Symmetry: D2
Subunit: 392 residues, 4 copies
């Protein structure tokens, strides 16, 4: 069995998450990426020159220009000698980036890296095929819908795949609506309690001839009306539906970044690590059955390390849909009071390439010394990633 | 202290033919070419499809391909639904970077068998229109090949225009570039007529309803040349004192490559004969405009890491993004030209950008003799390069 | 003053090209210049004698500012020539001649050019001004949107024809027989050289290519009679009657006439071809456009006290085979006197041009003393008609 | 038969809305229906008496089949009403009234509606038919391509205007003073209730929100006199004079007039507002469009045998402040008689409508027996002019 370098997280920072066409919509994903990368190096207390390589998750790259990760990195003022790779595992991209960076560090191939995710759904373009215009016209397709939200094999929206799981596991509209209100409640309380003080950095939006706007908290959690929640119409299934706009995640803009290093490099640089990356895994199922893939990924991680579900102090199961979280709670049989305790994607929003990084960053700050955190995240195609960390 | 890692071997390397832009393979999406190459490689390796645990594919222009390009390629090759997939974008270096990242996973003992490679259908890359309000006076529809593929962000100019900068700096003139180009076409033709791609390339059946089937069995781009016209062509990337032409630059193309990678232990367990050993690899980056020299630094890093000398390398694959790039690498490293790009390269064979990094590694795997060392390097937009060293078993 | 008598001095046209075919490289305005220059030449007058110009042109999007001004200046007419572009859909080319005649009748001008032009090959697609809707953006075809869709009923012109086929009991086999007869007559007239004075050749010039001379209508050769009764009914899948073969096609072309008062014709000593006797517009319920030409033609006959039997030649624009059969059925006229040298089903239908072409064709084909009546339906339920007498 | 006398019985218009402003949810044809129905109600005649309709409309792309027919049927006029859409660029609304007057004069109809309509807010973008070129393409704005760019010089109308500014020595400060004058006259006319009989209100209804009643022109309030001299000369960088403030703006609106023969007005017991005396078109070098209205007006005066002093009020369309000043200078007329209640620079310029608006304004503002002269330049180097006398 290989003898590997130990991998630690020294910082984890993110921009606030902006609403679709909302507060951060004038900023390209690469600029949000630059902001999170700069913030994370500042918080790590290290020279920018120490960062050897960068990986960033980013699902909808069309129209962002050549090499998005290179743009974010050079935009953050890191050396032109820094190699860059952009990662796409759909909704899992931000986590898979951290995983792959960890593997490089484990091998001794680099001693310090930046890893995370970025997405500007506000700036995702429409496409027109190459070739000749057909008589009678054409619809130009929305890349959010075509590349981001539509299952290739079933030719249906992610939300309609979720209805499939709602059926099999008997997870009703009222249960999903209750989970959703719970998420919005938890997000608000966390923000009010100042729980994001270290994690989130403000972004100043500048427009020539107009006043500056400082965006210092997540935009999405205030965009709800609890009285309307149970009256909303089910968009992805008109007949016997359970998923709505309120209980599903939303379209958003944001970036997150982590400074990762070997335990050795943390010592050399006289920095105090926050958590240790212990294990991680990918699992896959039938594409339509993506909501349950995180069950299997999580069990793999637990089994690999020889821990039991009860050993986990804090769970982050990405809230792609309220259904997804409930499906995981049911199948794993874990205590819901330990799941997504400070809100999640249903109320905070889902910039798809960054969510995987955000949830790992959140565990890092929220866990108490010695406690174990497990983050898992489903993705388009029938996949999931999961990661176990231990607070230091 | 250095970690103790698993040994990684190449068990098979397989590719589609490379088709010209809007040419013989243009009806097929990148993901389908991926599925063909992936199935090719599995079959050639003689293992059951269920043995492959995970897949990484390079793919630069993913717009309009649909959700999860790599997952599409993998499921379309009939691999299990249990197989995790990730799509890699290091621009021109993507196909090699996929192999490198897969290798690191194997080294860590996180997987025992994986497929890695690259795929690109430049014929099928779309145009984009921005979200929002239509601006008075007009709306632009940008070409994603130009916008995401070939334009340097920082300098706001084409790759070939950046290339002119290195041509200038190292005094590499039009004639040498043209000579290299003709050399590339010559080698390609020779190799194809000699049957040197007999175990490397698998043929493609193109089916159209009503139409007779087309069987594409060889690379398309190398026949598209006229040596007498080469010196006459205009330098399309710079008005004053140009050297880069369509003839001596790589072309836009479609194709896919896939490699089956495993640990030494897994190759024993499955009773397969490994082709090559993956020894070392590196990434380097310089000023974005200076991308032609990045492979020099990456190659040096690899040699220095393994403690080998340039003279120890039996065969070099320096990606022929531009004739210029190969010449500059030959110059700075002072290696023997007769050992470089022996059976052609991207100037004559084509450059489906996400595929090329995987192709050249796959080529060394088949070309090297028992015990020989091969080094492959590749520049990428933004100022980067990847390099890989292998040894034939 | 008293109303002036109006004469046709010349009438000229380009060949009609197929959709994306022989003339597709030329904009409508350029075809217009070609027709206008040819008509002035045939008239035997200086370009400076032309006082004002009206051209029909339905699909003007993307043609640039003032299409008729472009056609006129492109033909080398004086910068002092006022220009107006006319849109009465399919009736545009005839309506331009009617309005110009009215100006001449008033003594407001003495010599004018009038006609029509269309390049359906070059009609663009449109995108709405505003915010791109989530989920996709629709690019509509102006041919379909402005040219061929009825506003009120939300159906294609071909579906309106199906509606008349139902009401008047005009079957598929009857429409197919008419169409084959149109193709047959077009070919016979070309072979007999009957367009030698009407049509002028067009030279298509491409940088680094050899010149191509287009000398004859393209559309009429594009047919297979054995396949006609097998074609799908595209506007109505169940129990349909209208097909691509028996409907008119999308096309490119221009036509132009030189019109004068009787006084100016005498002053300039030209030999007039025909006198303009009378003209009229009629309109009916939008879906019923195929029958509007019946009322328009009846109006002109009544106005001058002539009976249907007094007419030597009828030009009833062949928008669909259905339209001509409906007109013959309602008017009870001799089919052997209708569209004798083919029409739009086999020659094509550049919509803004056809109304002018059919008037011009009568001017060449009628024998001295004979009356010709031209009528043409238009989208929205309209029709125009004109009666001329050969001099 | 002798020429018939033509009278204006009513003249009505919508408010003019700003680009993407108060009326931007309404299609041009809907504004046309509103103005047409208003004009007929004001005339006090049965709607069935209206025999035919012509409407000016420059930017017809994407409005659907037969825009005039849509306006007409949408106003509830009979389906027996023939319809034609007129395009003489900026002159279209006047040219429609002129052409309709010619039909009446000939005795071809006894009652017509004529006017103009434009919704610049709803003008689309175009993409060429064919295969997309490697490297991408710019979808063109039809307002720019078809409305405002001179074909021959390949520059904006605003840049063509600079040529005349240079030639006649009309400086920036003088153009700015004229512009401020127009805004001032517009406000004062609105405050004095001068449009009470001319303008009808429009109610804009949206599902799930309250009605908005648009009762006055929107444009003249969008100004700050202190900023007028600080604006950039956007049509010519060096030695420029034309700005966004001293040029007309992009707007939405429609206007319609009811026209009759004197005999028809007698038969229907209608008291007409004004008599149409004479009209003319002139044309010069396309770049020199601002001076064409001088020649068109002189033609009309010379035709009728009036001197400039005989004219009580002038409407010279304010396409640019530059145009009005060039006209005042060349004709040597009292500026206090010119565009008395504002004009296009401050009220806006829905291009197909303005030529009709200015004739309708004279019809209301003139005192009994007084002569008014309206003139309007158009892209391509044209102008139309019309003389009326108040009854
Ligand atoms: Cl996956
Ligand atoms: Cl890089
Ligand atoms: Cl009509
Ligand atoms: Cl004109
Ligand atoms: K929600
Ligand atoms: K080449
Ligand atoms: K046909
Ligand atoms: K203004």
């Amino acid at each position: 069995k290989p003898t590997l370098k130990e991998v630690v997280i020294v910082s984890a920072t993110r921009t606030p998450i902006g609403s679709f066409l909302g507060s951060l919509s004038l900023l390209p994903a690469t600029k949000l990426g630059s902001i999170a990368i700069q913030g994370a190096i500042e918080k790590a207390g290290i020279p920018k020159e120490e960062v050897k390589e960068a990986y960033m998750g980013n699902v909808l790259q069309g129209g962002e220009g050549q090499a998005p990760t290179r743009q974010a990195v050079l935009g953050a003022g890191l050396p032109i000698s820094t190699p860059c790779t952009t990662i796409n595992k759909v909704c899992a991209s931000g986590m898979k980036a951290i995983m792959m960076a960890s593997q490089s560090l484990m091998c001794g191939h680099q001693d310090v890296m930046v890893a995370g995710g970025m997405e500007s759904m506000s700036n995702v373009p429409y496409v027109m095929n190459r070739g000749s215009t057909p008589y009678g016209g054409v619809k130009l397709e929305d890349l959010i819908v075509k590349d981001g939200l539509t299952d290739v094999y079933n030719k249906i929206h992610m939300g309609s795949c979720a209805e499939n799981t709602a059926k099999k596991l008997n997870i009703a509209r009222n249960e999903q609506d209750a989970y959703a209100i719970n998420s919005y409640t938890r997000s608000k309380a966390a923000w009010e309690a100042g729980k994001f003080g270290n994690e989130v950095i403000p972004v100043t939006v500048t427009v020539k001839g107009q006043p500056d706007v400082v965006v210092k908290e997540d935009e999405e959690y205030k965009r709800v009306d609890f009285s309307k929640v149970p009256k909303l119409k089910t968009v992805f299934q008109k007949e016997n539906g359970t998923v709505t706009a309120a209980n599903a995640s939303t379209l958003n803009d944001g970036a997150a970044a982590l400074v990762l290093m070997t335990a050795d490099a943390a010592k050399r640089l006289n920095v105090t690590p926050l958590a240790r990356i212990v294990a991680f895994a990918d699992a896959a199922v039938e594409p339509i059955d993506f909501p349950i893939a995180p069950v299997y990924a999580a069990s793999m991680v637990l089994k690999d390390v020889g821990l039991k579900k009860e050993d986990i102090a804090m769970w982050e199961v990405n809230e792609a849909f309220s259904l997804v979280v409930l499906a995981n709670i049911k199948m794993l049989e874990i205590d819901p009071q330990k799941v997504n305790i400070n809100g999640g994607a249903v109320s905070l929003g889902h910039p798809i390439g960054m969510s995987g990084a955000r949830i790992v960053g959140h565990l890092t700050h929220a866990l108490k010394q010695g406690e174990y955190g497990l983050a898992s995240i489903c993705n388009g195609g029938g996949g999931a990633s999961a990661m176990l960390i231990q607070k230091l």
